[PDB]
Design an enzyme around this catalytic site. Sequence first.
Site, mmCIF file in Angstrom:
data_model
loop_
_atom_site.group_PDB
_atom_site.id
_atom_site.type_symbol
_atom_site.label_atom_id
_atom_site.label_comp_id
_atom_site.label_asym_id
_atom_site.label_seq_id
_atom_site.Cartn_x
_atom_site.Cartn_y
_atom_site.Cartn_z
ATOM 1 N N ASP A 46 0.847 -1.194 0.000
ATOM 2 C CA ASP A 46 0.000 0.000 0.000
ATOM 3 C C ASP A 46 0.880 1.240 0.000
ATOM 4 O OD1 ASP A 46 -2.903 1.037 0.518
ATOM 5 O OD2 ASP A 46 -1.590 2.150 1.889
ATOM 6 N N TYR A 51 3.027 9.751 0.015
ATOM 7 C CA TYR A 51 4.035 9.143 0.867
ATOM 8 C C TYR A 51 5.450 9.462 0.408
ATOM 9 C CZ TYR A 51 0.061 6.228 2.329
ATOM 10 O OH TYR A 51 -1.188 5.755 2.752
ATOM 11 N N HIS A 113 -7.718 9.223 -2.182
ATOM 12 C CA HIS A 113 -7.116 9.136 -0.831
ATOM 13 C C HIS A 113 -8.029 9.710 0.261
ATOM 14 C CE1 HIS A 113 -2.794 9.087 1.036
ATOM 15 N NE2 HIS A 113 -3.678 8.761 1.973
HETATM 16 N N1 LIG Z 1 -5.623 7.861 4.703
HETATM 17 C C1 LIG Z 1 -5.262 6.577 4.435
HETATM 18 O O1 LIG Z 1 -5.750 5.895 3.501
HETATM 19 C C2 LIG Z 1 -4.216 5.978 5.401
HETATM 20 C C3 LIG Z 1 -3.994 6.570 6.623
HETATM 21 C C4 LIG Z 1 -3.044 6.003 7.466
HETATM 22 C C5 LIG Z 1 -2.385 4.874 7.039
HETATM 23 N N2 LIG Z 1 -2.649 4.354 5.818
HETATM 24 C C6 LIG Z 1 -1.883 3.170 5.261
HETATM 25 O O2 LIG Z 1 -1.941 2.151 6.338
HETATM 26 C C7 LIG Z 1 -0.533 1.838 6.787
HETATM 27 C C8 LIG Z 1 -0.580 1.315 8.275
HETATM 28 O O3 LIG Z 1 -1.165 2.348 9.099
HETATM 29 P P1 LIG Z 1 -0.146 3.176 10.022
HETATM 30 O O4 LIG Z 1 0.995 3.754 9.218
HETATM 31 O O5 LIG Z 1 -0.970 4.138 10.833
HETATM 32 O O6 LIG Z 1 0.616 2.083 11.031
HETATM 33 P P2 LIG Z 1 0.072 0.755 11.776
HETATM 34 O O7 LIG Z 1 -0.073 -0.351 10.759
HETATM 35 O O8 LIG Z 1 -1.078 1.047 12.671
HETATM 36 O O9 LIG Z 1 1.361 0.499 12.646
HETATM 37 C C9 LIG Z 1 1.752 1.322 13.742
HETATM 38 C C10 LIG Z 1 3.154 0.948 14.258
HETATM 39 O O10 LIG Z 1 3.056 -0.533 14.640
HETATM 40 C C11 LIG Z 1 4.327 -0.987 14.802
HETATM 41 N N3 LIG Z 1 4.287 -2.398 14.480
HETATM 42 C C12 LIG Z 1 4.079 -3.115 13.376
HETATM 43 N N4 LIG Z 1 4.115 -4.397 13.598
HETATM 44 C C13 LIG Z 1 4.322 -4.484 14.982
HETATM 45 C C14 LIG Z 1 4.456 -5.638 15.696
HETATM 46 N N5 LIG Z 1 4.341 -6.972 15.267
HETATM 47 N N6 LIG Z 1 4.650 -5.582 17.038
HETATM 48 C C15 LIG Z 1 4.747 -4.320 17.569
HETATM 49 N N7 LIG Z 1 4.637 -3.132 16.878
HETATM 50 C C16 LIG Z 1 4.440 -3.265 15.542
HETATM 51 C C17 LIG Z 1 5.132 -0.236 13.690
HETATM 52 O O11 LIG Z 1 6.322 0.214 14.190
HETATM 53 P P3 LIG Z 1 7.737 -0.315 13.478
HETATM 54 O O12 LIG Z 1 7.894 0.300 12.120
HETATM 55 O O13 LIG Z 1 8.816 0.216 14.380
HETATM 56 O O14 LIG Z 1 7.703 -1.798 13.445
HETATM 57 C C18 LIG Z 1 4.143 0.928 13.302
HETATM 58 O O15 LIG Z 1 4.863 2.216 13.308
HETATM 59 C C19 LIG Z 1 0.130 3.022 6.437
HETATM 60 O O16 LIG Z 1 1.559 2.806 6.343
HETATM 61 C C20 LIG Z 1 -0.534 3.406 5.009
HETATM 62 O O17 LIG Z 1 0.066 2.462 4.100
HETATM 63 C C21 LIG Z 1 -3.529 4.877 4.972
HETATM 64 C C1 LIG Z 2 0.363 9.955 6.722
HETATM 65 C C2 LIG Z 2 -1.070 10.130 6.354
HETATM 66 O O1 LIG Z 2 -1.781 11.195 6.673
HETATM 67 C C3 LIG Z 2 -3.013 11.066 6.213
HETATM 68 C C4 LIG Z 2 -4.076 12.096 6.421
HETATM 69 N N1 LIG Z 2 -5.228 12.121 5.535
HETATM 70 C C5 LIG Z 2 -5.051 12.756 4.249
HETATM 71 C C6 LIG Z 2 -6.446 11.603 5.889
HETATM 72 O O2 LIG Z 2 -7.387 11.655 5.153
HETATM 73 C C7 LIG Z 2 -6.601 10.946 7.235
HETATM 74 C C8 LIG Z 2 -8.018 10.827 7.772
HETATM 75 C C9 LIG Z 2 -8.660 12.147 8.039
HETATM 76 N N2 LIG Z 2 -9.953 12.294 8.429
HETATM 77 C C10 LIG Z 2 -10.116 13.632 8.552
HETATM 78 C C11 LIG Z 2 -11.306 14.392 8.941
HETATM 79 C C12 LIG Z 2 -11.015 15.781 9.420
HETATM 80 C C13 LIG Z 2 -11.384 14.713 10.404
HETATM 81 N N3 LIG Z 2 -8.942 14.227 8.233
HETATM 82 O O3 LIG Z 2 -8.049 13.310 7.919
HETATM 83 C C14 LIG Z 2 -3.149 9.843 5.530
HETATM 84 C C15 LIG Z 2 -1.880 9.239 5.631
HETATM 85 C C16 LIG Z 2 -1.570 7.904 5.031
HETATM 86 O O4 LIG Z 2 -0.720 7.122 5.518
HETATM 87 O O5 LIG Z 2 -2.200 7.581 4.009
#
Ligand SMILES: NC(=O)c1ccc[n+]([C@@H]2O[C@H](COP(=O)([O-])OP(=O)(O)OC[C@H]3O[C@@H](n4cnc5c(N)ncnc54)[C@H](OP(=O)(O)O)[C@@H]3O)[C@@H](O)[C@H]2O)c1
Ligand SMILES: Cc1oc(CN(C)C(=O)CCc2nc(C3CC3)no2)cc1C(=O)O
Length: 311
Positions: A46, A51, A113
């Site tokens: 992903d 990013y 996004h």
């Molecule tokens: N708006 C969107 O669509 C959106 C928003 C947020 C995230 N995302 C996507 O979702 C991904 C995951 O969400 P996130 O970045 O918030 O992180 P997450 O998957 O909730 O992970 C949080 C932290 O968990 C730790 N971790 C992972 N495996 C672990 C394990 N087995 N045991 C203990 N700790 C562990 C990692 O630290 P370490 O690196 O130190 O292992 C990581 O920094 C993102 O990278 C992105 O690709 C999308």
């Molecule tokens: C590193 C990162 O930052 C973001 C932030 N964005 C663009 C979001 O949409 C998050 C959700 C969100 N909900 C809201 C409503 C205002 C309440 N505002 O933001 C996504 C990621 C990723 O890892 O993809």
Amino acid sequence: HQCVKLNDGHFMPVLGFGTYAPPEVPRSKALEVTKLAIEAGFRHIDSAHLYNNEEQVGLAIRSKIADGSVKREDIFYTSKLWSTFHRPELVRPALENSLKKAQLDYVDLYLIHSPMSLKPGEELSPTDENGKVIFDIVDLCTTWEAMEKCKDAGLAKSIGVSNFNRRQLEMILNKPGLKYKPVCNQVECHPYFNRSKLLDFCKSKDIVLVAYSALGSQRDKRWVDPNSPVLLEDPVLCALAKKHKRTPALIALRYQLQRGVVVLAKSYNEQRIRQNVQVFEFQLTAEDMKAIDGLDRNLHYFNSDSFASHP
Ligand SMILES: NC(=O)c1ccc[n+]([C@@H]2O[C@H](COP(=O)([O-])OP(=O)(O)OC[C@H]3O[C@@H](n4cnc5c(N)ncnc54)[C@H](OP(=O)(O)O)[C@@H]3O)[C@@H](O)[C@H]2O)c1
Ligand SMILES: Cc1oc(CN(C)C(=O)CCc2nc(C3CC3)no2)cc1C(=O)O
């Protein structure tokens, strides 16, 4: 390991590798850890224009194809249209740019996004004189039409959305002349914000819910109050990890799989990356699932502040 069939006939691996790291992390790390994730068995990766890592994620994928570990068809690669590119004439050029950076001919999945639109431009986080983010107003149905053309062009195998609520999904699903439903809605989902209502809505429409921050987020100082609860320190998750001889992270990932949610997991540490693939090795009971369901507290690690401070 396993996959779910999407509403367009394509298939999505149920465990995905999250690639976001904050700007202080060298871009060379995304290259290294994406190779480690593929080596460990991840096949869904992903990424996103936001990013600033699609070149390194694409180099990692190409490297693992070139060394014969995988073929391109074995990898499910996601990118996302950033909110400065919602205006319909910007959608295909944004996708083509992501493809040129990753050096891929197509993405497996292209998402909107966020439903919030931002001023068009080159800045990820456009701001005015007073430091406030400058929003834009776009008819997302027109953005969706432009995404549908990207699928018809073969540049994206599947298209979907992220951060949409029920009302916003309905606006798409109800659009006259809709050709492709979103295959997924990628949203914040974890035991402290389990999204049960949106999950039941998505299931009724054959839309997969994809969970991010499933491990409780990176707790980035730009947006997360340090006083918010730490998901992985939860006493229920700890007790369940002891019952199963697993870790709280593994409990949190397995929870989503058993409720029909596709789950992402970011880790930049080789051992934790390899640990997360063990989510396929064990099972939670119905009682364990009910205990985790009781953890919901409507806690959002991501809110409106997460649009600012992206350099
Ligand atoms: N708006 C969107 O669509 C959106 C928003 C947020 C995230 N995302 C996507 O979702 C991904 C995951 O969400 P996130 O970045 O918030 O992180 P997450 O998957 O909730 O992970 C949080 C932290 O968990 C730790 N971790 C992972 N495996 C672990 C394990 N087995 N045991 C203990 N700790 C562990 C990692 O630290 P370490 O690196 O130190 O292992 C990581 O920094 C993102 O990278 C992105 O690709 C999308
Ligand atoms: C590193 C990162 O930052 C973001 C932030 N964005 C663009 C979001 O949409 C998050 C959700 C969100 N909900 C809201 C409503 C205002 C309440 N505002 O933001 C996504 C990621 C990723 O890892 O993809």
